[PDB]
Design a protein around this ligand. Structure first.
Ligand code: HQY
Ligand code: HQY
Ligand code: CS
Ligand code: CS
Ligand code: CS
Ligand code: CS
Ligand code: CS
Ligand code: CS
Ligand code: CS
Ligand code: CS
Ligand code: CS
Lengths: 222, 225
């Protein structure tokens, strides 16, 4: 599938979410360069104010843009499932707080890469770090370990994401990730990805938004 | 002094370190844009394989290229020391491990911003996160609290750097930083903070132990202003 990702590919992300009843929608437009492992996107909240902090939606808001080095091309599941695409289902548990439950489809629609997502956050408490909006405008992770699930013909990943809290503490986010191809065609070994995220604001944007620049690279101590 | 950083300024970094007896040198070339708070550099180890993981040297490998907002220009200590420059002394205590001790001079040689540092690390353990090289190739986002030292006509800062470890844990690096002008008039700031976001990458066309660093630093904390 590593064919349609040479050159720059336009990205559209659509998310419809519901956290504790608070229903919202986010639309992100941009473009990705898998050759350089580069993502340049801009998300806005189409419905109004975002009920959760932007960093909390980073993991949910296209791993098919990660740069796989030429000697690790056998590890690329994300590209392989294209243009048929894959389904990314996730469960994100926030320590001492609520839980995100996401289901998304990442596929090629025309010559534009699309990530369409349904999100259901429940049992979220306040003050907290999510509903109370006390997470800083940044993002830290790594390194994410991807395994193959040959029993479902997809991949499984489990990782811990630490969100920096404004007081100086740390908000834990346990990600349990499952990916399963839509079509049939394409099974990687134990490898890790290395995305690096930087968050900013559009000075000419008076709405709720997040400008995301990202650097994803595949690597492996094997 | 701030008018020296309008536009793109070339940057030369030179780091000479000694960790547990292991001597090493790092040479960095790049350019910085203080208006956008952008910072592009490339560091190489000219003495061979780096004895320490790259992330631990990022904090020591030029805060005069940070983006200060229009209303906080009067609180920009770093640019006001230019072109004569400033001295930046640091003690970095790694929790349950050794300690870096650094002293740097950041000044304008010709039309080039040069950071010449001296590093000495002691009491590091071999099977630890640093000498055992257990740290992941990244760098977390941070918020530094910059305060004014009116007794040294300079500034003070103390912060916590979290380096990611391979086993899914965190290696804490406690930084103690003090910046002093030469004397020689400098702007002493009010209580404010810097926000830092870095990205480390490699050059595939380099066969030497290196680090390609991209960095975005912005200033905030003062209410208008
Ligand atoms: C997805 C998007 C951005 C990140 O920084 C990231 N880190 C770790 C795992 C997944 C992921
Ligand atoms: C210097 C460079 C990059 C960083 O991320 C950083 N963080 C905190 C203090 C200093 C510093
Ligand atoms: Cs743009
Ligand atoms: Cs939970
Ligand atoms: Cs499951
Ligand atoms: Cs040499
Ligand atoms: Cs290293
Ligand atoms: Cs120590
Ligand atoms: Cs980062
Ligand atoms: Cs001191
Ligand atoms: Cs002096």
């Amino acid at each position: 599938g590593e064919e349609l990702f040479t050159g720059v590919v336009p990205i559209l992300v659509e998310l419809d979410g519901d956290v504790n009843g608070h229903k919202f929608s986010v639309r992100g437009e941009g473009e990705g360069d898998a050759t350089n492992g580069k993502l340049t996107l801009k998300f806005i909240c189409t419905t109004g104010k975002l009920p959760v902090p932007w960093p909390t939606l980073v993991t949910t808001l296209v791993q098919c843009f990660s740069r796989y080095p030429d000697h690790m091309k056998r590890h690329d599941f994300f590209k392989s499932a294209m243009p048929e695409g894959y389904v990314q289902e996730r469960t994100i548990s926030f320590k001492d707080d609520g839980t995100y439950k996401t289901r998304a489809e990442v596929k090629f629609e025309g010559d534009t890469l699309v990530n369409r997502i349904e999100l259901k956050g429940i049992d979220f408490k306040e003050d907290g770090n999510i509903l109370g909006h006390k997470l800083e405008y940044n993002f830290n992770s790594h390194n994410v370990y991807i395994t193959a699930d040959k029993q479902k013909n997809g991949i499984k990943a489990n990782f811990k994401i630490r969100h920096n809290v404004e007081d100086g503490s740390v908000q834990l986010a346990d990600h349990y990730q499952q990916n399963t191809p839509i079509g049939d065609g394409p099974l990687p070994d134990n490898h890790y990805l290395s995305t690096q995220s930087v968050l900013s604001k559009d000075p000419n944007e008076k709405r709720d938004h997040m400008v995301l620049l990202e650097f994803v690279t595949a690597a492996g101590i094997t």
